[PDB]
Enzyme design. Structure first.
Site, mmCIF file in Angstrom:
data_model
loop_
_atom_site.group_PDB
_atom_site.id
_atom_site.type_symbol
_atom_site.label_atom_id
_atom_site.label_comp_id
_atom_site.label_asym_id
_atom_site.label_seq_id
_atom_site.Cartn_x
_atom_site.Cartn_y
_atom_site.Cartn_z
ATOM 1 N N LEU A 1 -12.938 -32.372 30.021
ATOM 2 C CA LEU A 1 -13.502 -33.618 30.388
ATOM 3 C C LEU A 1 -14.545 -33.959 31.329
ATOM 4 O O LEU A 1 -14.865 -32.808 31.898
ATOM 5 C CB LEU A 1 -11.941 -34.446 31.072
ATOM 6 C CG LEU A 1 -11.029 -34.633 30.006
ATOM 7 C CD1 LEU A 1 -9.759 -35.079 30.687
ATOM 8 C CD2 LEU A 1 -11.338 -35.658 29.050
ATOM 9 N N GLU B 1 -4.377 -40.931 35.440
ATOM 10 C CA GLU B 1 -5.082 -41.256 34.101
ATOM 11 C C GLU B 1 -4.387 -40.435 33.120
ATOM 12 O O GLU B 1 -3.943 -40.974 31.790
ATOM 13 C CB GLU B 1 -6.541 -41.180 34.157
ATOM 14 C CG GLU B 1 -7.263 -42.215 33.307
ATOM 15 C CD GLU B 1 -7.024 -41.632 31.548
ATOM 16 O OE1 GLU B 1 -7.285 -40.549 31.414
ATOM 17 O OE2 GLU B 1 -6.983 -42.594 30.841
HETATM 18 N N1 LIG Z 1 -11.888 -38.121 27.313
HETATM 19 C C1 LIG Z 1 -11.202 -38.161 26.095
HETATM 20 O O1 LIG Z 1 -10.319 -39.105 25.896
HETATM 21 C C2 LIG Z 1 -11.178 -37.125 25.140
HETATM 22 C C3 LIG Z 1 -10.333 -37.129 24.091
HETATM 23 C C4 LIG Z 1 -10.406 -36.020 23.071
HETATM 24 C C5 LIG Z 1 -11.149 -34.900 23.385
HETATM 25 N N2 LIG Z 1 -12.038 -35.070 24.520
HETATM 26 C C6 LIG Z 1 -13.224 -34.108 24.927
HETATM 27 O O2 LIG Z 1 -14.037 -34.142 23.526
HETATM 28 C C7 LIG Z 1 -14.218 -32.566 23.213
HETATM 29 C C8 LIG Z 1 -13.810 -32.140 22.188
HETATM 30 O O3 LIG Z 1 -13.810 -33.016 21.053
HETATM 31 P P1 LIG Z 1 -14.993 -32.854 19.776
HETATM 32 O O4 LIG Z 1 -15.628 -33.993 19.193
HETATM 33 O O5 LIG Z 1 -15.918 -31.938 20.489
HETATM 34 O O6 LIG Z 1 -14.218 -31.895 18.858
HETATM 35 P P2 LIG Z 1 -12.857 -32.292 17.921
HETATM 36 O O7 LIG Z 1 -12.927 -33.361 17.178
HETATM 37 O O8 LIG Z 1 -11.731 -32.206 18.789
HETATM 38 O O9 LIG Z 1 -12.833 -30.838 17.022
HETATM 39 C C9 LIG Z 1 -13.720 -30.559 16.078
HETATM 40 C C10 LIG Z 1 -13.181 -29.514 15.010
HETATM 41 O O10 LIG Z 1 -11.858 -30.340 14.759
HETATM 42 C C11 LIG Z 1 -11.884 -30.056 13.383
HETATM 43 N N3 LIG Z 1 -12.104 -31.434 12.425
HETATM 44 C C12 LIG Z 1 -12.468 -32.545 13.060
HETATM 45 N N4 LIG Z 1 -12.326 -33.433 12.433
HETATM 46 C C13 LIG Z 1 -11.611 -33.184 11.239
HETATM 47 C C14 LIG Z 1 -11.177 -33.737 10.186
HETATM 48 N N5 LIG Z 1 -11.239 -35.178 9.782
HETATM 49 N N6 LIG Z 1 -10.669 -32.855 8.971
HETATM 50 C C15 LIG Z 1 -10.555 -31.657 9.473
HETATM 51 N N7 LIG Z 1 -10.886 -30.983 10.430
HETATM 52 C C16 LIG Z 1 -11.352 -31.720 11.552
HETATM 53 C C17 LIG Z 1 -13.043 -29.091 12.700
HETATM 54 O O11 LIG Z 1 -12.478 -27.803 13.068
HETATM 55 P P3 LIG Z 1 -13.053 -26.484 12.116
HETATM 56 O O12 LIG Z 1 -14.431 -26.256 12.833
HETATM 57 O O13 LIG Z 1 -11.840 -25.279 12.291
HETATM 58 O O14 LIG Z 1 -13.181 -27.079 10.578
HETATM 59 C C18 LIG Z 1 -14.163 -29.513 13.739
HETATM 60 O O15 LIG Z 1 -14.887 -28.475 14.060
HETATM 61 C C19 LIG Z 1 -13.754 -31.862 24.481
HETATM 62 O O16 LIG Z 1 -14.850 -31.875 25.412
HETATM 63 C C20 LIG Z 1 -12.473 -32.622 24.885
HETATM 64 O O17 LIG Z 1 -12.231 -32.375 26.282
HETATM 65 C C21 LIG Z 1 -12.013 -36.176 25.312
HETATM 66 N N1 LIG Z 2 -6.640 -41.898 28.004
HETATM 67 C C1 LIG Z 2 -7.047 -40.568 27.858
HETATM 68 N N2 LIG Z 2 -7.188 -39.589 28.674
HETATM 69 C C2 LIG Z 2 -7.674 -38.427 28.458
HETATM 70 N N3 LIG Z 2 -7.949 -38.031 29.466
HETATM 71 C C3 LIG Z 2 -7.508 -38.116 27.084
HETATM 72 N N4 LIG Z 2 -7.680 -36.749 26.883
HETATM 73 C C4 LIG Z 2 -7.668 -36.395 25.670
HETATM 74 C C5 LIG Z 2 -7.910 -34.903 25.275
HETATM 75 N N5 LIG Z 2 -7.775 -34.158 26.395
HETATM 76 C C6 LIG Z 2 -8.942 -33.458 27.082
HETATM 77 O O1 LIG Z 2 -10.165 -34.026 26.453
HETATM 78 C C7 LIG Z 2 -6.523 -33.782 26.745
HETATM 79 C C8 LIG Z 2 -6.365 -32.572 27.700
HETATM 80 C C9 LIG Z 2 -5.050 -32.441 28.279
HETATM 81 C C10 LIG Z 2 -4.212 -33.219 28.107
HETATM 82 C C11 LIG Z 2 -2.855 -32.648 28.834
HETATM 83 O O2 LIG Z 2 -2.756 -31.672 29.457
HETATM 84 N N6 LIG Z 2 -1.786 -33.598 28.791
HETATM 85 C C12 LIG Z 2 -0.354 -33.492 29.499
HETATM 86 C C13 LIG Z 2 -0.371 -33.469 30.897
HETATM 87 C C14 LIG Z 2 -0.126 -34.799 31.425
HETATM 88 C C15 LIG Z 2 0.014 -34.608 32.855
HETATM 89 O O3 LIG Z 2 -1.111 -34.049 33.617
HETATM 90 O O4 LIG Z 2 1.176 -34.711 33.531
HETATM 91 C C16 LIG Z 2 0.590 -34.434 28.718
HETATM 92 O O5 LIG Z 2 0.216 -35.527 27.916
HETATM 93 O O6 LIG Z 2 1.691 -34.149 28.442
HETATM 94 C C17 LIG Z 2 -4.348 -34.373 27.520
HETATM 95 C C18 LIG Z 2 -5.368 -34.556 26.706
HETATM 96 C C19 LIG Z 2 -7.318 -37.551 24.547
HETATM 97 N N7 LIG Z 2 -7.197 -38.489 24.926
HETATM 98 C C20 LIG Z 2 -7.232 -38.934 26.310
HETATM 99 N N8 LIG Z 2 -6.850 -40.456 26.251
#
Ligand SMILES: NC(=O)c1ccc[n+]([C@@H]2O[C@H](COP(=O)([O-])OP(=O)(O)OC[C@H]3O[C@@H](n4cnc5c(N)ncnc54)[C@H](OP(=O)(O)O)[C@@H]3O)[C@@H](O)[C@H]2O)c1
Ligand SMILES: Nc1nc(N)c2nc(CN(CO)c3ccc(C(=O)N[C@@H](CCC(=O)O)C(=O)O)cc3)cnc2n1
Length: 186
Positions: free
Chosen positions: A22, A30
């Site tokens: 993140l 959160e």
């Molecule tokens: N703030 C938030 O709410 C939140 C939520 C989620 C993630 N994140 C952050 O976002 C980053 C990860 O997300 P990202 O966009 O980089 O990657 P991601 O979508 O989680 O992973 C991408 C990989 O997933 C597979 N993939 C994705 N879509 C697919 C589909 N429709 N069908 C089949 N395979 C699929 C592929 O793997 P293969 O290469 O093996 O085919 C692709 O290389 C991390 O930094 C994480 O911490 C944040």
């Molecule tokens: N609103 C909101 N916020 C985000 N951060 C978010 N993150 C993501 C994806 N990632 C990081 O990219 C995560 C990384 C770790 C956890 C995790 O370890 N979860 C535990 C621990 C709970 C605790 O700490 O007790 C659980 O869910 O049980 C969940 C998501 C997706 N969707 C989110 N949507």
């Protein structure tokens, strides 16, 4: 199965990730919101299913995988085998959703939660039909390499309130944020 939902936390500059994690410091409440919303089933005898891409799976610390109380499905086109700890591995989002329509899975799965990353959100958000977006607005810019697309308000309605969601501005570690719920029905 029940409704289809995305949940995400986004910075002011629409960032969701940086270097596989993140972009902001850990926000305890959160994370607790993410946990509560994705785990809480509205139907007795069922669990929710979380669908995520491969990089999002590995962004969860190993000690927390699979996400407890939820069925964990990972999307990957290239993995030979499901990642250790995952409950399901699917080659496409359509394959994942059709899995939820299997009778013995449908009677155990309530809500389906898309929990990222970028490409998974984008595909889900353009899928016609009922969809909710649970969006945490992190009210600060953060350096990011992974982003969320800006929400089309002609399609998604910002709900004025939602059961179980606090509407007041929150703050942890000097970072203000607020919980939003959007809904489309196209
Ligand atoms: N703030 C938030 O709410 C939140 C939520 C989620 C993630 N994140 C952050 O976002 C980053 C990860 O997300 P990202 O966009 O980089 O990657 P991601 O979508 O989680 O992973 C991408 C990989 O997933 C597979 N993939 C994705 N879509 C697919 C589909 N429709 N069908 C089949 N395979 C699929 C592929 O793997 P293969 O290469 O093996 O085919 C692709 O290389 C991390 O930094 C994480 O911490 C944040
Ligand atoms: N609103 C909101 N916020 C985000 N951060 C978010 N993150 C993501 C994806 N990632 C990081 O990219 C995560 C990384 C770790 C956890 C995790 O370890 N979860 C535990 C621990 C709970 C605790 O700490 O007790 C659980 O869910 O049980 C969940 C998501 C997706 N969707 C989110 N949507």
């Amino acid at each position: 199965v029940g409704s289809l939902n995305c949940i995400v936390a986004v910075s002011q500059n629409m960032g969701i990730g940086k270097n596989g994690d993140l972009p902001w410091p850990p926000l305890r409440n959160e994370f607790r919101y993410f946990q509560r919303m994705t785990t809480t089933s509205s139907v007795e005898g069922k669990q929710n299913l979380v669908i995520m891409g491969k990089k999002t799976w590995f962004s969860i610390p190993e000690k927390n995988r699979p996400l407890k109380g939820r069925i964990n499905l990972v999307l990957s086109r290239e993995l030979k085998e499901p990642p250790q700890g995952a409950h399901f591995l699917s080659r496409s989002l359509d394959d994942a959703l059709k899995l939820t329509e299997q009778p013995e899975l449908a009677n155990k799965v309530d809500m389906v939660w898309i929990v990222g990353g970028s490409s998974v959100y984008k595909e889900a958000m353009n899928h016609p039909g009922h969809l909710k977006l649970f969006v945490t607005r992190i009210m600060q810019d953060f350096e990011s390499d992974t982003f969320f697309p800006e929400i089309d308000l002609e399609k998604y309605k910002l709900l004025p309130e939602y059961p179980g969601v606090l509407s007041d501005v929150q703050e942890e570690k000097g970072i203000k944020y607020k919980f939003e719920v959007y809904e489309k029905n196209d």
